[PDB]
Amino acid sequence: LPYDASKWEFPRDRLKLGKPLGRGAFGQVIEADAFGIDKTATCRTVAVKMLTHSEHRALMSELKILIHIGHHLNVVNLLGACTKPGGPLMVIVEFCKFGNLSTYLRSKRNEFVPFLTLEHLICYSFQVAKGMEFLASRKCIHRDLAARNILLSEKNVVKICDIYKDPDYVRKGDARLPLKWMAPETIFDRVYTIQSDVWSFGVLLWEIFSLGASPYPGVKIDEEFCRRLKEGTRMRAPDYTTPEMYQTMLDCWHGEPSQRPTFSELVEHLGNLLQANAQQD
Ligand SMILES: COc1ccc(-c2oc3ncnc(N)c3c2-c2ccc(NC(=O)Nc3cc(C(F)(F)F)ccc3F)cc2)cc1
């Protein structure tokens, strides 16, 4: 796709290198301080993804996809890039200072009461639905929608984002089993659609209302698990759910993709639950 450098290109000399945020198999991310990236005279912390032709192509692909998606409050947003010859290829996105939502909710289990409250949990759910409705409108499918892939920014705003680590330092929580988020049709027939994202969203809801527990507690994820899933077996309600939120999970887990709610429908419904939650008398 084309690249409008006027719109996106940011000077490398206006990025002050900061702390490493992670290296994966392909691409390392660092914090940086960017002067003037939003055209005002401010220094802003940002996250920078930086680097074979295959690797170059993949990072350039991410840049182009982000430009295509465009801007929404609840999707990690592209701020700029450094592509011109003479320095590394860099993709600059919004920094989310509080990390992923799964780990965060886990850390708050002794700081929750109906502190986190149902208002927070329903709000996070609503925001993710809003981000997914947006992505669906751009004809995108996420394919691994899970609380680990939702980052937490200031003022409780959550943002959707999209095997390598030294085993000496691996801790419980550092990995998850993506199979546990996959729709039956994605498991059995590698079918990914916006409606399989809705199934995943149901799992993400369960994560939120379990305050960051792993799905299908104690269940072995094998051919038997998969069989029971197709037949209709579902997770039980998590410990901090409301009845309405568990009903929504069940709806998202409809066995027929076309009978699951759409993200627009989930936005309307969750917005209603959220509004009802904070009403008077
Ligand atoms: C080892 O690999 C990694 C290490 C650290 C991080 C990271 O850490 C962070 N800490 C704080 N804020 C951030 N934005 C990040 C980020 C960070 C870096 C990049 C991105 N990029 C995207 O989300 N891209 C993206 C997003 C989508 C979307 F989900 F929005 F649809 C689709 C395709 C995409 F390529 C999002 C978050 C990402 C990968």
From Swiss-Prot:
GO annotations of cellular component type: anchoring junction; cell junction; early endosome; endoplasmic reticulum; endosome; external side of plasma membrane; extracellular region; Golgi apparatus
A biological-process GO annotation: positive regulation of ERK1 and ERK2 cascade
GO molecular function, one term: integrin binding
Record-annotated disulphide pairs: C140-C161
Post-translational modification: N-glycosylated.
Family of the protein in this entry: Belongs to the protein kinase superfamily. Tyr protein kinase family. CSF-1/PDGF receptor subfamily.
Job of this protein: Tyrosine-protein kinase that acts as a cell-surface receptor for VEGFA, VEGFC and VEGFD. Plays an essential role in the regulation of angiogenesis, vascular development, vascular permeability, and embryonic hematopoiesis. Promotes proliferation, survival, migration and differentiation of endothelial cells. Promotes reorganization of the actin cytoskeleton. Isoforms lacking a transmembrane domain, such as isoform 2 and isoform 3, may function as decoy receptors for VEGFA, VEGFC and/or VEGFD.
Official protein name in the record: Vascular endothelial growth factor receptor 2
Biological source species: Homo sapiens
Gene (name only): KDR
Residues of the full protein shown: 820 to 1171 of 1356
